[PDB]
Amino acid sequence: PQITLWQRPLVTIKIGGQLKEALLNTGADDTVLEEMSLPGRWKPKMIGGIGGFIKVRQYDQILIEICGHKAIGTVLVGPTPVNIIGRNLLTQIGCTLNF
């Protein structure tokens, strides 16, 4: 689909058997989701944004469905204010910027 930006570019995702909404985020290298229950092992990680840093758990090779497009990659879970789909997953669904 083509998505314009007059509104937040929110899409439906399915991950860990659960449905959520997430923001397509070109300003995000990685994907960061609010606290959720994800299955297997993880690693502690720290990531910085505009106002400082948060602790997140890193899950590798997680399957995620983003607006009907399946991708597998790293997902970070932690006290992010919004679910963010970063470029790591955006490239998998073939997402581009255009103007």
Give the whole-angstrom CA distance, residue 77 versus residue 33.
5
Among 60, 68, 81, 91, binds ligand 52Z (CB under 6 A): 81
Instruction: Quote the tokens at residue 86.
Output: 């970063």
Do 76 and 60 touch, CB atoms closer than 8 A? no
Among 18, 49, 68, 91, binds ligand 52Z (CB under 6 A): 49
Residues 37-96, interacting with a copy of itself (CB under 8 A): 47-54, 67, 69, 80-81, 84, 87, 90-91, 93-96
88 phi and psi angles, rounded to 5 deg: -50, -35
Residues that bind ligand 52Z (CB under 6 A): 25, 27-30, 32, 47-50, 81-82, 84, 86
